[model samples]
Target: AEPVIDTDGNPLHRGGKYYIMPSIWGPPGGGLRLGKTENLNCPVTVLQDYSEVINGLPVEFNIRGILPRTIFTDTELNIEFTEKPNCAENSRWSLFEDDKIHKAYVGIGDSEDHPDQEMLSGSFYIKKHGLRNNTYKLVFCRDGSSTCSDIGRYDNNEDGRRLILTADLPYEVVFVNAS
Candidate 1:
């Protein structure tokens, strides 16, 4: 396989472990924080938290929510952190060639310049396989409706994986900048 690059279209060479968090679009957006839940057998439905400082470098802004975080695989659907990265391979993603997230995700919508399309690019969802062998898919809410409008579903031509979305939750996720 080839290598990965960063948002600047350069080699992704961050000094230390990176992070991937869920975010929303707004005057005040929230980060996807692991929340307290009682679900174990299923992936914990991720929630939002207002986070601005990651490890020290104030982030939580401008960068799209799909911006891969150097997540601790602990960011599992486990409904618990249990604790918590060596920049773990599983959590590492990059905006590689043609401006795609990692190597698989690309902005899917009107045009790259379209504001709505841009927003869609930032939305992300990671597919769980076994342990530590998962792949992510970026999605866009093209219906142009309010967040969590509780409607619609993404379909594939055939034999393709589909996202089973929850009504009261968001599908097109974005981020905010931490000052």
Candidate 2:
């Protein structure tokens, strides 16, 4: 046997040994603040900032802005440990520059059975743009409805919602090999 499956019906795969590095940390009050750039470089700037408070307590927060660096096309961008404010409802992640837009692909676990649950995982691809700075905003909402007090910038406004600002830096994009 090639050590296929263990006694518990678990298949031995390369990802089983794949582990994430522990170099990032959350913000001051126990919320995720750092964006882990997969293939992108570091030392990016923060253009906008936003935070969501529930019952007067900070529950979720995110950054949305522009990265000075460009991401090559057909590159996989992994958003590791990106927390969601409400897990009960579905959310949508979108990427954009000025006129171009790319939708985030959601990847769920192998045993995920719900549609909303399936949209929480997976990676998104980054398209190529000129060296000019581009704005990449991430809007977080519940059940695909923009009703809740979500995050991100809308029409360049940061009112009635939370928005994050990422200054000039390399866009985070992870590389993946297709089998």
Against the hidden true structure, what lDDT does model 1 obtain?
0.24
Backbone clashes in each candidate structure, one number apiece?
Answer: 10, 13
The positional error of residue 38 in candidate 1, measured at the CA in angstroms, is 4.1
- List model 1 lDDT by residue over 104-159, tens digit each: 22211223222211223223222321222222223223234543211111222211
How does model 2 score by TM-score? 0.22
State the lDDT of candidate 2 residue by residue for 1-179, as single tens digits: 12222223343232222111111121211122222122212211111123322112111111233332223233233332232234212222322122111322221122121222223332332332223222122222334443322122221331222122233322221121111
Give the alpha-carbon lDDT of every model. Answer: 0.24, 0.24
Clashing pairs in 1: 18-70, 19-69, 19-70, 20-69, 44-77, 59-178, 60-176, 60-177, 61-176, 61-177
Q: Evaluated with TM-score, which candidate comes out highest?
A: 1
